[PDB]
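Retry 2 of 3 after timeout on previous attempt. Resubmitting structure tokens to design endpoint.
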């Protein structure tokens, strides 16, 4: 370091502060974008540049060449967390700022493009090792593995205490990306916010709020400009339909979402997801953290674009 400030071209320098930023098609700039975000979000001092770079490149190596759950998704989810943190400066601890961008970059490590359900019906060894949140316990495991490589300990300055705290933020943040867990997490938050029992000084409450941030960042393709949203959906479904094919190979009719013979039902499927998942997620998030409102507004814009697709207005 340490008078070595990363800088981006002007258009990226400005637009990276906005929730709807797309990191672009130049894979070799993504490490640079992430370090930029860590530097501005956390400090130039929070991590040793040499170690941070080495960690980022091993994380990248451990993402697979799958249509959707890839390195670009990792960096996209970390950019949404960066926009949330930078719009809510004073609400987060020094440990939280450190751990959350790392959690986001690692949250789908070694994803194979298959759901927890498929692993369970295939009888994959991971499903025997981890009975719930199967892929998410795997992703956390891969994170600890990489932190334990020589020259990869980006947390080397933390005390024993702070190190266990930061790895516990990361574990909880990554487990929360299991959408099966989102529904009750958001119900509890909605009740806590409305009865006014929500207390950010309660560690158990902070946990829930970071859980919700993790779902928000993870689903953030629905908060992009329509052409980004529309073209990402193609990647999402290319994984869904492969999984559907693999279900049929086990002798199991897949759900329609995964059946490539039911492509026609995609736009109605997106409506259900926006209504049952996305809109509620950003709504409750915007109640807890008012400056995240642009994510809700962009989500509602994309809902209305999918209504236009159904009405043949596109
Ligand atoms: C009744 O639903 C449930 C009830 C209890 C537990 C689990 C569920 N499932 C909910 C659905 N599940 C999904 O993975 C997802 C389905 C879709 C669809 C359609 N578009 N996107 C998506 C993602 C990211 C961006 C844009 C669009 C997603 S992600 C799995 C779990
Ligand atoms: Mg995941
Ligand atoms: Zn993800």
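Retry 2 succeeded. Sequence:
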């Amino acid at each position: 370091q340490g008078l070595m400030q990363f800088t981006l071209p002007v258009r990226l320098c400005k637009e990276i502060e906005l929730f709807h930023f797309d990191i672009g098609p130049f894979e070799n700039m993504w490490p640079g974008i992430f370090v930029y975000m860590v530097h501005r979000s956390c400090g130039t001092s929070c991590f040793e540049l040499e170690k941070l770079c080495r960690f980022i490149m091993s994380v990248k190596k451990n993402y697979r060449r799958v249509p959707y759950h890839n390195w670009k998704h990792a960096v996209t989810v970390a950019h949404c967390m960066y926009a949330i943190l930078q719009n809510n400066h004073t609400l987060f601890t020094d440990l939280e700022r450190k751990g959350l961008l790392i959690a986001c970059l690692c949250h789908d490590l070694d994803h194979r493009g298959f759901s927890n359900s498929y692993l369970q019906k295939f009888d994959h060894p991971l499903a025997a090792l981890y009975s719930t949140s199967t892929m998410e316990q795997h992703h956390f495991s891969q994170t600890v593995s990489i932190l334990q490589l020589e020259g990869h300990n980006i947390f080397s300055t933390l005390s024993s205490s702070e190190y266990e705290q930061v790895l516990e933020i990361i574990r909880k943040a990554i487990i929360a990306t299991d959408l099966a867990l989102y529904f009750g997490n958001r119900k509890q938050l909605e009740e806590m916010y409305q009865t006014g029992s929500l207390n950010l000084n309660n560690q158990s409450h902070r946990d829930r709020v970071i859980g919700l941030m993790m779902t928000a960042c993870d689903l953030c393709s629905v908060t992009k400009l329509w052409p980004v949203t529309k073209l990402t959906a193609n990647d999402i479904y290319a994984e869904f339909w492969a999984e559907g094919d693999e279900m049929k190979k086990l002798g199991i009719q897949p759900i329609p979402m995964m059946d490539r013979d039911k492509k026609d039902e995609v736009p109605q499927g997106q409506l259900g997801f926006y209504n049952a998942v996305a809109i509620p997620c950003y709504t409750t998030l915007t109640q807890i953290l008012p400056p995240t409102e642009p994510l809700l507004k962009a989500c509602r814009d994309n809902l209305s674009q999918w209504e236009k697709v159904i009405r043949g207005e596109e």
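Attempt log closed. Residues 179-180, 183, 219, 221-222, 236, 257, 269, 273 surround KI8 (ligand 1) (CB under 6 Å).
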